[PDB]
Write a protein that binds this ligand. Structure first.
Ligand SMILES: Cc1ccccc1C(=O)N[C@@H]1[C@@H](O)[C@H](O)[C@@H](CO)O[C@@H]1O
Length: 457
């Protein structure tokens, strides 16, 4: 707007501007950290998915899948057939009071009757008995696919006595009632690599850009450190990994962690998942709020104005999103927002700063966010491929285009349009649902023809 203001704006341009050189530096220690975690030790979990097989698109049949979080349980029935799939679903809301039940039988009892309900709805007969895939985004501890132990409750549950294998926990309540078999317990990122690969052979990774961020890809058993248990395993071929890289650089030798980012760390149930904190859009409204508050204090904006704004995480992700989507010019939509929302009255020169700031903040989450994608392709040597992306942040103003060209940056591609880029980020197929059904079909057979599903016991 005015000189004093433009100055302050260019310095925020210095703070949130992240050049390829930085991105290249980050990507480089990312390769290494990746390696680190596949080795006998390392800070990125890099937990094997136990998906030992590619997948054809020629796999057929009826498969069950569920995923539940706080709120709902999605039960999906999916119909598989020579590279296409038909899903049908239903959701059930967690009985208020579940999450904090004293009795564990309650949770499983819940998923078993919902299951009973869906089948009775869906079949009303049926003879064979169908495999089920449980996507349990919560805590590793898969020894095998058919496994799964709660490491720690996320999503805000707290149910006494579980850090057990959640699997035996649920089937039990099945027999009791009757009809299906839990053949695989998995992660949402795995699911999207898999289901997405069944429909598109060119898929090289499965990534989520939502509240949390993570990715999955296929490594190969001989390039791992798990090599000490196997036998029936092709002796060097096809192992899916759940990176759980939202923790990269908790050591901090290389993310361009600004003062705003330190603060966000601190105020968080502290000091972890720093790659997530620096590229998760879940925190982008709070990063926006901090600079804003910082300029108020230095008396450059919101002169006079009252603050109900100085409330940690008052601004969610939808605030910069909306400010970025502001179509016209005098940024009429932001003024509306700040106003009665916060009851602030800003002039258009401020709105200009608020917008330019949302701008920086979005683009850098989008840029940093692909550093672990290009790290995989490099480490695994994928010169071309498709990255199947899922997450809420992909229905965030210009995120798709941003990471895309961030990638063109890191690599150096001189290409006009995205569609022409060697590695393209495309939308995934359903990770949580179908991906979990496609992994059961894979699983089940391995069991069937008993080929082996985990580390030698
Ligand atoms: C915080 C924590 C600690 C270690 C291992 C798992 C977690 C986690 O929830 N991480 C989840 C991850 O499992 C999931 O794939 C993504 C995308 O949905 O969201 C977070 O990153």
């Amino acid at each position: 707007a005015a000189a004093x203001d433009x100055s302050l704006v260019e310095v925020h341009x210095x703070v949130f501007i992240v050049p390829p050189x930085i991105l290249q530096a980050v990507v480089s220690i990312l390769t290494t950290r990746x390696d680190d975690x596949d080795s006998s030790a390392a800070s990125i979990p890099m937990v094997p998915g136990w998906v030992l097989k590619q997948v054809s698109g020629a796999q057929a049949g009826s498969f069950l899948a569920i995923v539940m979080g706080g709120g709902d349980l999605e039960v999906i029935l999916i119909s598989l057939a020579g590279r296409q799939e038909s899903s049908i679903x239903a959701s059930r809301s967690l009985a208020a009071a579940m999450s904090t039940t004293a009795i564990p039988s309650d949770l499983w009892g819940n998923x078993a009757x919902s299951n009973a309900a869906f089948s009775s709805x869906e079949f009303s007969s049926x003879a064979g008995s169908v495999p089920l895939g449980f996507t349990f985004x919560e805590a590793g501890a898969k020894e095998x696919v058919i496994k799964g132990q709660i490491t720690x409750q996320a999503x805000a549950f707290s149910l006494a006595x579980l850090x057990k294998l959640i699997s035996a926990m649920x089937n039990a309540x099945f027999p009791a009632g009757d009809x299906x078999x839990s053949v695989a317990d998995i992660x949402d990122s795995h699911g999207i690599l898999x289901x997405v690969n069944y429909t598109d052979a060119x898929i090289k990774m499965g990534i989520i850009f939502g509240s949390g961020v993570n990715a999955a890809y296929w490594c190969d058993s001989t390039x791992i450190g798990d090599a000490a248990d196997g036998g029936x395993x092709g002796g060097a071929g096809x192992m899916x990994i759940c990176c759980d890289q939202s923790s990269f650089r908790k050591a901090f030798p290389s993310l361009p962690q600004i003062x705003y980012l330190x603060t966000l760390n601190x105020x968080s149930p502290x000091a972890x998942k720093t790659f997530x904190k620096n590229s998760x859009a879940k925190n982008x409204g709070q990063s926006l709020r901090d600079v804003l508050m910082x300029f108020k204090x230095x008396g450059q904006x919101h002169x006079x104005x009252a603050x109900s704004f100085x409330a940690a995480n008052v601004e969610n992700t939808s605030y910069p999103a909306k400010i970025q989507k502001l179509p016209h010019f005098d940024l009429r939509x932001x003024x509306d927002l700040f106003x009665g929302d916060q009851g602030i009255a800003x002039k258009t020169x401020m709105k200009x700063v608020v917008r330019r700031x949302l701008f920086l903040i979005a683009a850098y989450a989008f840029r940093l966010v692909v550093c672990x994608i290009x790290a995989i392709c490099q480490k695994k040597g994928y010169s071309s491929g498709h990255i199947a992306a899922x997450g809420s942040x992909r229905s965030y103003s210009g995120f798709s285009x941003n990471s895309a060209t961030x990638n063109x940056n890191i690599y150096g591609w001189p290409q006009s349009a995205x569609x022409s880029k060697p590695i393209x980020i495309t939308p995934a197929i359903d990770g949580x649902g179908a991906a979990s059904x496609v992994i059961x079909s894979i699983a089940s057979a391995x069991x069937s023809x008993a080929x082996x599903s985990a580390x030698x016991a």
